[PDB]
Design a protein around this ligand. Structure first.
Ligand code: ATP
Ligand code: MG
Lengths: 128, 471, 578, 41, 40, 468
């Protein structure tokens, strides 16, 4: 007798999950398109500064080879070496003085770290 | 908050413990991800922090972890669980991740799993009588709403069936109490710590039969599951239960299937940490740790919800002196202790009433709550059953031929008690039926021996024979 | 690979330096002669290696190479009719390579590489293949051994070999991505093999022993523990289970036990018949032997290897019985290795994770739907050897929390040579209520009721024994004497079973039902007669009791006629008494 | 009387075992502190 | 009977379609809002 | 032939000393410790590491110092020299002669720990050893390749039974059916913790009957170093294996007072500071005892055998003590002595009921003894157990209440105790023991012998106890 209620509840839950997943996929596709926009240098600069101030005494800052040109001056003023790392994309990475600690600011990390907190906001905006 | 700091530099991996040196920014108690070379992510909690290194207890097996490609990253400083009213009808695993295939839930609050103490000033006195339908519990070991009443089981005793039956049959009696007549049901939170597939299959099948899986949250840590994940399961369950009860006015019934397994996990961690043990190797802080779980039940002034706990634990060798039952009984508000002797005789539920107890019983029985004769009837039943057991011991050494008439009446009472009050099978007995049976049984004794029952009650209820009920 | 050097040797524990990068629970070769061991601790640049071989004669500075891979078994055609050691090394090959003694360092493949296998494809090119499917079949010993996809492998088939004779190493199928699927694959022994879903045990595990098969049953995917002191009959019980049970395959695991028992199995089973398929018994048996005087740490490997092979045959759709000869010796191995680690011990010096390991091992039992969609089960019977017979000990109590049956062996019964010597007061089974429908549809509609009646009679006799001894057999009443004598009959006519007798060693369910019905009919008639005034001595002097005595010795084919005759005779003899 | 004697012997054995385990633990921890002082002070 | 199950399936699918359309209504607005929120 | 000495001793406490630069000292290597006085005492490497190597010293460390002591390597693995000339000799448990005769010349140097026997190489014990004692030869037959212990007590005559079995043990090839030629039979006698008195007794008992000529005696005193006791069983079993599997001998090995062995094992372990087991005994006691007991057996393709008769004394007569308990878990049965039979003045005081021989079924019958052996043994067991049950039934109703069958069974039990068990120093043959058994059974009616086939009853029933 409760089978119908269970089926309806499962359908509603999976539908809401599908809408949320669509939102997340769209935000992913948008974030990966950020570099092409003319404001990308500002984003790179701010992320690099956040990483540097979040890793006191950092030895070196690692960024995409195509992105270090936007970081040529910032590294010199802060006195930290730069390195070319093709694997990292749309993000910056920092390596500590000890060499055993590092900080990553890749936009995917930010997305998948703040998604849990922003899920309530997405839910209340979609189905408020 | 929005950035990922990764700690390479692990110096030690042995058993459940991991040491990471330069992690001076990890908070005490924080939750971390351990990423190995192959990319598998495993969890863990910080249980010691210093400028030298941080001790991390891992929540999974350490196979494949190396000191070169393994890294530790932070998830959060305080272990919190996302909590939504839409958790009802969902099945989660020990660490609270879905295992039913449905999408992860959207939280309304993220509450710490440890929780906080309930202020004694805020607490309300539990006074609502819950009818379980089992005479030994209802009449002699009454359960109220807002109580911690565990079941003390054995290796092969049917405690799981008793828990399933209590969940199936539980209800308040608004008619007998005088308060508003409402038929709101219980919301059942079910925490399985190291449960076998047989027991879990039984529980799931029973709940599906009763249609209670819609109003139940399940946190399942099986026997093949990691052992150190059991530290978090009861705390996640109680976080959910407290949320529902004291923010959405639910009456929550929480079942913690095997607390022995939990205590074993605690011992594993403590032994790894060189903690000074108490008795039988269990950590010295086991009492406090168990109180952090059991004391998360009750009722609060100015709110309509409640939390009720029915923990189930297996006494290792049917030993009540073992640390786990001992500390639990020192913490909880009574216990229902099963008996293997009654089990062998075929009595179900095999509940021995002499070692059982319900502290809060007097708050939920009497005039205006169940019935005026309740308390004195229970006291008299205990007296008569104790006399019967003593007379059995006397016969074991002297033989039936020497027994006086009153002694034989008490023996017959004990046997009839075991066969008609304790033994009920799967049957929902209203408190009135249970009192009627108790009275029919006490009628086997002369009027004057009922020293614990007031004269007026004796006049109003004594005399009916047991044949009037059956046959 | 990662290369190091021995830094410290102490018992079976070797510490290797310069092993940074080595992973936990990864095999390594210790010493010049490449002794096999597993890593169980990582500290700095060092790795703690537990060795599955003798460490005498090793020196500091010797090489230690890590293999990068955990402890695994080779799963493929060639395991049946075979005897293996703890780490799956064929003992016949070891013998014919190194003589009557076991010498450390032998490198031999578990599956013979020079044998040709008749192979029949069942996958066409271009068919999608997922973990657990059957690519083809091969005849092994009268079994249709199915060649499986490794559990964690998915892909599409590019080429399939044709029907013919191939060795194990032959790639019999190649996926579109280049992965080569052979007749065998490896699997870590500490990871349970995946399944689609678990099922509720609803079919009996027929053991051939009346007490176990009647009073304390076990379902086909269930778990049983059989603790007892020495001399009680654990080994004989397990051998009888391996000889007469209805499992398609049996995997016998002798951990830390006598070698004469493995020799007995090997000498005897090749000249015994399979209960169902009718072929030699060995063709359905896998023997894992790590005797008492073999390396201690190999006991753990033996347990895990046995359970993994059992899981494999379950994944081929068989019903598999796993017999662990002594889990106590596995616990002892854990205790020794923890002593070398300097871990803080739980009760009686066992490590505090003993219960978790036992639980993981026993939880691999169950009736399941296989990844290929077929039905399979693994039934684990676990022997326990408590010190001094004390059942309050950690291994027994940690086993009692996970097993569904508890076959308690008793020294008192074993000393009076009453075998199987199962204490029926302190034993229990949790599959009695689940198997009732099967009993009703396969033995008789009233089987459960008669079984309950016999249990009740046994309980009543146990009660009356106290007064009998305290007061004297004669002083009792008369019906009580009937209860006592009928309990005697039940014990010495139904519960007893001679595992060495040609006929009594095995007993069908119908035979047990027949004996039970005969006893109960006798009891009812005797009660009536006592009411009628017949004396006890007259009842006991009846000759029909002797016919009930020899019932268990009657052959199965001859037994229904014997049962009809005895049923007629009980009435005929007890009516004329008047 | 023999039964009670056997029970007494069993209980005494269990208590002696618990005492031995406690002594072993105390030795381990005392060695731990001594080694700490000797090596890292 | 199976008529009740068929009705339940029909209503479940109708509810799924309705919620999907309700999402379609403001999916892009929600995506923009969350994008603005994540950025400083 | 050159030797390397290590002077880097840095620690000496208890039985351990540490050597600094001992990287080439193998694990399990035997060493020689030479002090300034010039005395040389031996030791063993129990742990080895880059920082130092730990050596356990066989004797007391008195007189050792960190300035003059040197350590040298003797051999990588403890070996022993074995020759066939050992027959007729005595040694001390290290192999050194103690009989005042020149030392033997070895034909081989065998490691004493020994390698494990592969199960595939063993063959089933299937032949019996005539011990000369009726209880053992009928009720608890000893089978060639078995390991059947004797469980004794504080004051019971374990030494006497050991000496008697060694003196009387034979192989009886005539009964084999094929009439095979006589096969060699030796007796290796391991004695541990034996006092001076018992050693004198055993020397006298082996010299009196000339059995010493076919025996190798390894005798260890109670004042000898503790580790010597550990090696004694391994030296004895090495000799036994050599003889059996390179000279086609049938060696019977008698190990006496294994309780003393377990006491020594506990002493050494506690010295090594290991986590204790049930009653202070090492957690590995079971494995150590298996490494001894699992060396008995018979191999496929060899005509020799090794049979072991360990002898134990149960503390407080407690069968649940770790020593008898672990021995029972390893061995293939048990012979148990009873104090009741001793207070009755019965020798040997073997109680048939709690005794057992697990391998008996496969070493009695046609071609091995004779066809009545198993049925007669089972029937004797039934009759004696029934008699004992009736005897304890007489503590209620009294003799006057017993029936005729009860009287017959009590009388049989008493006569059984008086004749079948009580045999003094007689060397009863298997045939003689079976005749005595049949005569005792003939007291009971022909119809009550439910376990004996009618043919055997007809053939052998009826003989009275005329032979006294
Ligand atoms: N069912 C049986 N029928 C006949 N004899 C039996 C039976 N069970 C046991 N026995 C007898 O008991 C002897 C000991 O039994 P078994 O080898 O099975 O012991 P166990 O309980 O496994 O003990 P251990 O731990 O010493 O190996 C067997 O050799 C046989 O003599
Ligand atoms: Mg055994």
């Amino acid at each position: 007798e409760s089978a119908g209620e269970l089926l309806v509840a499962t359908a509603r839950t999976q539908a809401r999950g599908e809408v949320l997943e669509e939102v997340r996929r769209r935000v992913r596709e948008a974030l990966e398109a950020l570099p092409q926009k003319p404001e990308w240098p500002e984003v790179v600069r701010k992320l690099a500064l956040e990483a540097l101030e979040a890793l006191p005494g950092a030895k070196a800052l690692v960024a995409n080879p195509e992105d270090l040109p936007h970081l040529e001056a910032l590294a010199r003023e802060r006195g930290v070496e730069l390195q070319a790392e093709p694997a990292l994309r749309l993000g910056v990475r920092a390596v500590g003085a000890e060499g055993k600690t590092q900080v990553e600011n890749s936009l995917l990390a930010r997305l998948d770290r703040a998604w849990d907190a922003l899920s309530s906001k997405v839910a209340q905006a979609l189905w408020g | 908050d929005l950035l990922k700091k990764e700690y390479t530099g692990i110096t030690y991996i042995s058993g459940p413990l991991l040491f990471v040196e330069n992690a001076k920014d990890l908070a005490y108690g924080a939750i971390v991800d351990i990423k190995d070379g192959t990319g598998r992510v495993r969890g863990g909690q910080v249980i010691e922090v210093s400028e030298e290194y941080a001790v991390i207890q891992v929540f999974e097996e350490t196979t494949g972890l190396d000191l070169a490609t393994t890294s530790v990253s932070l998830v959060e400083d305080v272990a919190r669980l996302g909590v939504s009213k839409e958790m009802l009808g969902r099945r989660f695993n020990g660490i609270g991740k879905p295992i039913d295939g449905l999408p992860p839930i959207t939280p309304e609050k993220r509450l710490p799993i440890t929780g906080l103490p309930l202020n004694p000033v805020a607490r309300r006195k539990p006074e609502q009588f819950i009818q379980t339908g089992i005479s030994t519990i209802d009449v002699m070991n009454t359960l109220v709403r807002g109580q911690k009443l565990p079941i003390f089981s054995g290796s092969g005793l049917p405690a799981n069936e008793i828990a399933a039956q209590i969940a199936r049959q539980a209800t308040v009696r608004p008619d007998l109490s005088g308060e508003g007549e409402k038929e709101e049901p219980f919301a059942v939170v079910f925490a399985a710590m190291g449960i076998t597939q047989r027991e879990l299959s039984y529980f799931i099948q029973e709940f599906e039969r009763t249609g209670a899986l819609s109003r139940s949250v399940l946190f399942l840590n099986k026997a093949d599951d990691p052992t150190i994940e059991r530290i978090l399961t009861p705390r996640m369950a109680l976080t959910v239960a407290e949320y529902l009860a004291f923010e959405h006015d639910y009456h929550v019934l929480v079942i913690l299937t095997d607390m022995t397994n939990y205590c074993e996990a605690l011992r594993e961690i403590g032994a790894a940490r060189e903690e000074i043990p108490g008795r039988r190797g269990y950590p010295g802080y086991m009492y406090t740790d168990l109180a952090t779980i059991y004391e998360r039940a009750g009722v609060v002034e100015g709110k309509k919800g409640s939390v009720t706990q029915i923990p189930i634990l297996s006494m290792p060798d049917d030993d009540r002196t073992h640390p786990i039952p001992d500390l639990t009984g020192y913490i909880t508000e009574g216990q229902i202790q099963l008996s293997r002797e009654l089990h062998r005789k075929g009595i179900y539920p095999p509940i021995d009433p002499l070692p059982s107890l319900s502290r809060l019983m007097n708050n939920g029985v009497g005039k205006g709550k169940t019935r005026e004769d309740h308390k004195q009837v229970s006291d008299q039943l205990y007296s008569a059953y104790a006399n019967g057991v003593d007379i059995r011991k006397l016969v074991a050494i002297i033989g039936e031929d020497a027994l006086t008439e009153n002694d034989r009446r008490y023996l017959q009472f004990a046997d009839a008690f075991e066969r008609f009050f304790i033994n009920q099978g799967q049957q929902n007995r209203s408190i009135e039926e249970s009192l009627q049976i108790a009275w029919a049984l006490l009628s086997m004794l002369p009027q004057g021996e009922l020293k614990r029952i007031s004269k007026d009650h004796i006049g109003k209820y004594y005399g009916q024979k047991l044949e009037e009920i059956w046959g | 690979m990662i290369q190091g050097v021995i830094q410290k040797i102490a018992g079976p524990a070797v510490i290797a330096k310069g092993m940074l990068g080595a992973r936990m629970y990864d095999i390594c070769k210790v010493g010049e002669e490449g002794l096999v061991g597993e890593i169980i601790r990582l500290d700095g640049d060092t790795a703690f290696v537990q060795v599955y071989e003798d460490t005498s004669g090793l020196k500091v500075g010797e090489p230690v190479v890590s293999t990068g891979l955990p402890l695994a078994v080779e799963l493929g055609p060639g395991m049946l009719n075979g005897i293996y050691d703890g780490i799956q090394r064929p003992l016949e090959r070891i013998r014919e390579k190194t003589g009557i003694y076991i010498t450390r360092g032998v490198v031999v493949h578990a599956l013979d590489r020079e044998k040709k296998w008749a192979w029949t494809p069942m996958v066409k090119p271009g068919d999608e293949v997922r973990g657990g499917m059957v690519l083809g079949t091969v005849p092994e010993f009268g079994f249709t051994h199915k060649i499986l996809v490794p559990p964690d492998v998915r892909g599409r088939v590019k080429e399939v070999k044709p029907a013919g004779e191939y060795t194990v190493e032959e790639p019999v199928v190649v996926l579109e991505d280049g992965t080569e699927l052979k007749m065998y694959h490896t699997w870590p022994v500490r990871r349970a093999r995946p399944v689609q879903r678990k099922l509720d045990p609803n079919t009996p595990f027929l053991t051939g022993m009346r007490i176990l098969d009647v009073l304390f049953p076990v379902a086909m995917g269930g778990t049983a523990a059989i603790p007892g002191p020495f001399g009680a009959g654990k080994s004989v019980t397990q051998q009888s289970l391996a000889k007469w049970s209805n499992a398609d395959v049996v995997v016998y695991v002798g951990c830390g036990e006598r070698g004469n028992e493995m020799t007995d199995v090997l000498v005897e089973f090749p000249e015994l018949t399979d209960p169902k398929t009718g072929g030699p018994l060995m063709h359905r048996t896998v023997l894992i032997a790590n005797t008492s005087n073999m390396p201690v740490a190999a006991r753990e490997a033996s347990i895990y290897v046995g359970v993994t092979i059992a899981e494999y045959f379950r994944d081929q759709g068989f019903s598999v019985a796993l017999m662990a000869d002594s889990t106590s010796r596995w616990a002892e191995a854990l205790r020794e290795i923890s002593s070398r680690l300097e871990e803080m011990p739980a009760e009686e010096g066992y490590p505090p994770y003993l219960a978790a390991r036992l639980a993981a091992f026993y939880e691999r039992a169950g009736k399941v739907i296989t990844l290929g969609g077929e039905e399979g089960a693994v039934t684990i019977v676990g022997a326990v050897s408590p010190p001094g017979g004390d059942m309050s000990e950690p291994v027994t109590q940690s086993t009692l929390r996970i097993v569904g049956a508890f076959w308690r062996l008793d020294a008192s019964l074993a000393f009076r040579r009453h075998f199987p010597a199962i204490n029926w007061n302190g034993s229990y089974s949790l599959f009695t209520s689940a198997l009732d429908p099967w009993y009703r549809e396969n033995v008789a509609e009233d089987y459960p009721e008669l079984r309950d009646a016999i249990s009740e009679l046994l309980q009543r006799e146990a009660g009356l024994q106290e007064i009998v001894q305290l007061v004297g057999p004669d002083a009792l009443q008369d019906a009580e004497r009937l209860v006592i004598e009928v309990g005697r009959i039940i014990r010495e006519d139904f519960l007893q079973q001679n595992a060495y007798h040609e006929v009594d060693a095995y007993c069908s369910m119908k035979k047990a039902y027949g004996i039970m019905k005969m006893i109960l009919a006798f009891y009812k008639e005797a009660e009536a007669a006592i009411k009628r005034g017949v004396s006890i001595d007259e009842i006991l002097q009846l000759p029909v009791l002797e016919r009930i005595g020899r019932a268990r010795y009657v052959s199965e084919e001859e037994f229904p006629a014997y049962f009809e005759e005895a049923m007629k005779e009980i009435q005929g003899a007890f009516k004329a008494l008047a | 009387i023999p039964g009670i004697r056997a029970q007494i012997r069993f209980i005494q054995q269990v208590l002696e075992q618990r005492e031995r385990e406690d002594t072993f633990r105390l030795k381990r921890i005392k060695g731990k502190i001594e080694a700490r002082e000797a090596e890292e002070e | 009977t199976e008529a009740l199950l068929a009705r339940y399936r029909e209503r479940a699918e109708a509810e799924a379609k309705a919620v999907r359309e309700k999402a379609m209504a403001r999916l892009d607005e929600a995506v923009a809002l969350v994008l603005k929120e994540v950025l400083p």
